[PDB]
């Protein structure tokens, strides 16, 4: 642990500064250091961890897609493939790092529904990113690992959270994207998005104005996908 000499609270403070400075690799390293202190993460701290790694892997995924597209056009010297492979290996390394933090030991210590669902959704997301670049022998096993994590998160969220809970909504959104983009199950994606949207709409009447805004924001993303898929 390169962050081992820094106080937990200082790592969290610096992760917030790094977000403001748009230094997402720094953010991720600070939050990794905070996780490695061994204490559970608060709601805000979980969000910082997720935002940091989502930005890091988001940049890698965008670059991988650019290079993969150039490579595929060239297959219609070794440099394009070599550089795509380098970016791919870097991306896989970040996903493995996130999955390692979840496995050592965030998930096993997460007893509340909000934390456990949050971490299992992350686990599904990072296996999904591995699946986007996977080809042979373990592509099926990677896909099943994403599916299994999302499914456990879904089972807990349906029993323990209201249908408008933003984490429950984002989990359903991302699982529907998994179905559409990874599992070649567009009908399952559409059905999940529709049922999620409808059950959320029926629960909006229970919410404060601020919660209503939080939930409808994510509901619009579900509707956006349904518009694209139908």
């Amino acid at each position: 642990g390169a962050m081992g000499s820094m106080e937990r609270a200082s790592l969290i403070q610096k992760a917030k500064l790094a977000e403001q400075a748009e230094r997402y690799e720094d953010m991720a390293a600070f939050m990794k250091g905070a996780v490695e202190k061994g204490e559970e993460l608060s709601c805000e701290e979980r969000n910082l961890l997720s935002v940091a790694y989502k930005n890091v892997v988001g940049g890698q995924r965008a670059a991988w897609r650019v290079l993969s597209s150039i490579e595929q056009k060239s297959n219609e010297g070794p440099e394009v493939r070599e550089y795509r492979e380098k970016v791919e290996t870097e991306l896989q390394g970040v996903c493995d790092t996130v999955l390692g933090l979840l496995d050592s030991h965030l998930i096993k210590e997460a007893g509340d529904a909000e934390s456990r669902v949050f971490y299992l959704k992350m686990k599904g997301d990072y296996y999904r990113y591995l699946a986007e670049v996977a080809t042979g022998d373990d592509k099926k096993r990677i896909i099943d690992s994403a599916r299994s994590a999302y499914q456990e998160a879904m089972d807990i969220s349906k029993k323990e959270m209201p249908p408008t809970n933003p984490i429950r909504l984002g989990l359903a959104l991302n699982f529907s994207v998994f179905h559409y983009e990874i599992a070649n199950s567009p009908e399952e994606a559409i059905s999940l998005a529709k049922t999620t949207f409808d059950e959320a709409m029926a629960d909006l009447h229970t919410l404060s104005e601020d919660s209503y805004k939080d939930s409808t924001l994510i509901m619009q993303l579900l509707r956006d996908n349904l518009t694209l898929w139908t």
Partner: peptide
């Protein structure tokens, strides 16, 4: 098809 953006705390 968009997942949660999730890029801003």
């Amino acid at each position: 098809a968009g997942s949660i953006p999730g890029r801003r705390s």
